[PDB]
Ligand binder design. Sequence first.
Ligand SMILES: */C=C/C1=C(C)C(=O)N/C1=C\C1=NC(=C\c2[nH]c(/C=C3\NC(=O)C(C=C)=C3C)c(C)c2CCC(=O)O)/C(CCC(=O)O)=C1C
Ligand SMILES: */C=C/C1=C(C)C(=O)N/C1=C\C1=NC(=C\c2[nH]c(/C=C3\NC(=O)C(C=C)=C3C)c(C)c2CCC(=O)O)/C(CCC(=O)O)=C1C
Lengths: 473, 448
Amino acid sequence: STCDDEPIHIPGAIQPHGLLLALAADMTIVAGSDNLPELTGLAIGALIGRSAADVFDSETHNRLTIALAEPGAPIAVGFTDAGFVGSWHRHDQLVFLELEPPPQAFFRRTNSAIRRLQAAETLESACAAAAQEVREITGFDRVMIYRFASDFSGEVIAEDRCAEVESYLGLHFPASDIPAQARRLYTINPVRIIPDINYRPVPVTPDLNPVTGRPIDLSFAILRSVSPVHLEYMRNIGMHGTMSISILRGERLWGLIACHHRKPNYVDLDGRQACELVAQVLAWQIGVMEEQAITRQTLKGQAIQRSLINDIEQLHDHRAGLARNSEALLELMGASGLCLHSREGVITIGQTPPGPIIDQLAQLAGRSGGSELFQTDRLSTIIPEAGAFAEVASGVLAVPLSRTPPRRVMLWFRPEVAQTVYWAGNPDKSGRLRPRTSFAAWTEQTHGRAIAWQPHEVAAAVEIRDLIIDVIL
Amino acid sequence: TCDDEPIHIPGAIQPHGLLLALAADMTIVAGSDNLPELTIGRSAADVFDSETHNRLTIALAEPPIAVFVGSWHRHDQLVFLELEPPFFRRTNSAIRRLQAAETLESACAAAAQEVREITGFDRVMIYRFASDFSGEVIAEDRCAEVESYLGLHFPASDIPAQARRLYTINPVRIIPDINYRPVPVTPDLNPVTGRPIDLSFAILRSVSPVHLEYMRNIGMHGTMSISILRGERLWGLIACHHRKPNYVDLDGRQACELVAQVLAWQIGVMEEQAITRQTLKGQAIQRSLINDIEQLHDHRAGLARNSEALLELMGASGLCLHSREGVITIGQTPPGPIIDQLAQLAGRSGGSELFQTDRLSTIIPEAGAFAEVASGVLAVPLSRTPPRRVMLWFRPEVAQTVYWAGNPDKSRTSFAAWTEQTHGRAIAWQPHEVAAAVEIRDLIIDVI
Ligand SMILES: */C=C/C1=C(C)C(=O)N/C1=C\C1=NC(=C\c2[nH]c(/C=C3\NC(=O)C(C=C)=C3C)c(C)c2CCC(=O)O)/C(CCC(=O)O)=C1C
Ligand SMILES: */C=C/C1=C(C)C(=O)N/C1=C\C1=NC(=C\c2[nH]c(/C=C3\NC(=O)C(C=C)=C3C)c(C)c2CCC(=O)O)/C(CCC(=O)O)=C1C
């Protein structure tokens, strides 16, 4: 898995659709797109050292001098008197600059759909809304949204695509289809467009940082050359025009708007400017629906909680009370059974496994990770011998009642479900490395897996311990 | 009597635009007296011709618009419709900036900055409410030569009680000329619910003359605000200003608002990463005097041994332990309305959330005599109402000098810079102290 090793930020080339300049403080252009000879008469070794204004208009000269002042795109490079597009940044310690060819109606489209994501009630009503709008404005034949799992494997959770375009919906993808580095930068470079995938790269000459002992960091490059492997990837997939957007909830890369096209296709700055905003608007709503659900589960835990308050007020042992209310509260968070583990007293309510519940789970419990909690959807995975009791103990939820010794333990159990997940692949079949040739959906049925706990169910158990405590006074 | 003037059924609108009220299965009933003139109760299909009525009616019937400019809404059960006389990279690039802004101040002076470049307004100030709902202009972006109101406090009265629920529910407002002569609505009879015309989501609505009095005073004749909503509670306001009158068209004023929503989350971003950047430093010395209190044969010998340490945690002038039976004081002590007038003050309208206050003579008036030890107070419930054993830390009074736009004594006249020396006020709390306290009681609970 050298996938996580290939240095992608220094491809030593940019793409042909634009041309690029790297400049120091006083606009000595350091490096250059090797198609810049076709731009000012000067082959690259002659551009080097030269000053910036001469290249340019007198209009476009001054207007970049002022944008550089503040210690952010887009200026226009009309330079001589045609019109170019000026995206820039500072990086390393020199200023980069990439160049691109050439109101209201575009913009009403945006808020009509900004405000649409605002009304979306479910993630799915939101994401077939997200993906939909990204498509009505980037025109791509296919606009999919990709969820990341814990592993950084993924799943198409929504999709919007023009008819005749074959569908990759509900499909899982390996954690390898985006390796470590790509994610480390897509967390910080939130956007990428590659418009032709058999593009011939236009190198930069030189590949040297005059600033430091380095090749050219092309991190904040929208023009940077990408891996040939991810290209073989996309000829395989049969989509020759592609674009992504990183969807970030709080500096953890959450998922991706990956758009696709059968033929090549170009999105201008404004077009993918709006698009950054869509992933931004949606990273918001995902956090709202996330948190407005935590209040509607905190909602129906009302009627059934008050039940076991009257039941510990009357019985004055809680275990006798709560375990009476057991037939509903374990369906509340859809648990199969639970058990209460006091190191003196273990009382198992409903469905539960024996004597390695105690030691092999409570010594497994919090690790005195004070602010932490323990769970799995698979338990045969972590205590392999639980494989035997996987039928009643496949997944688990558990809550401490104290700084360890006291090691008071509550735990919810979930049984094994035969679920079917499907993917393109062959996630085992993932000289150089090589990308897959076929992406037809194969289905896997899963042994030993619980249904996924969500904070939605977690908030339930979370609330329970916080009341048992209130009563104990 | 400030919280009493009914502004929402003012029975009039502003002259620059004109508006009509119609009966829902569409026929038009009650008319604004600003529109009859240059163009009584009628049937409704009767609009421009089928183009702007029908395609626009079907869009409003089933589920903005262009006709003049056609904004609408449904309210107190009838159909509204307002009319006013008749870029994008800027908007996103300021989200993109509003997202990278590192501190609360860089969040607001970015906020303040775009809203100016998109209304051209002479002054775009950002106005945070403190708890009492007095306020302070915390950041500002402005055209030169125009007087600067930054770091300035204002009365809570400059926007009264009712006015606020409205900015809590109608999130935006513009009046372009403040000496508009109000052109009435006729009638101001709701034909549906038979009482005056609720003009709540009317953006053309006639505004209060009291606040008109305001802007002739201040000398700014073109103004617009946007209210900032963090979770259904009015947190603050983008108050924009202009020396002359000025109109911002509709799509132009939609962009202004969206910025405040971005900041309503962006502030919520800051709200929560300072909330965890403190719990760290934080643990390291805390966990120490937990084990030194966790020398519990029982706790006072444990706690009060290291209390002289845990007291330094929160600017604890004194604290108290309040169980209905056992009240234990660490440090400087208030005596008998500690028990009764604070723990009943505590969980009543507890609202599941805690009580903290900087002022006590304002919340229990007799605390005035004890300002030297009790001017501000914090308390945490142990939780059910009651026994509700409540712990509480307090703070003495600090002499700060606060600045105001003119004296805080009202009708108002002029708002030049004057100083008040503020007595009986304690110095504040944000969670590096509040989160401390929360974590602290969590410890005490884990203890018994
Ligand atoms: C082991 C090497 C790789 C395999 C196998 C593979 O599939 N990808 C490998 C490395 C890289 N991928 C790069 C970019 C990239 N990968 C994806 C993955 C998907 N694209 C899709 O459309 C879907 C699903 C519908 C998936 C799962 C994406 C989206 C991207 C970004 C570009 C785009 O939008 O298509 C990559 C980085 C190249 C670079 O930009 O430097 C590498 C190294
Ligand atoms: C208690 C009555 C009032 C006093 C006293 C007063 O000074 N004004 C009073 C009444 C109203 N104010 C209304 C709206 C309003 N008020 C403010 C106050 C400020 N403007 C500023 O620029 C700053 C600070 C820099 C402050 C504190 C604002 C911003 C607004 C909203 C409109 C605007 O942008 O100016 C108001 C409502 C009138 C209506 O809607 O009919 C009333 C009654």
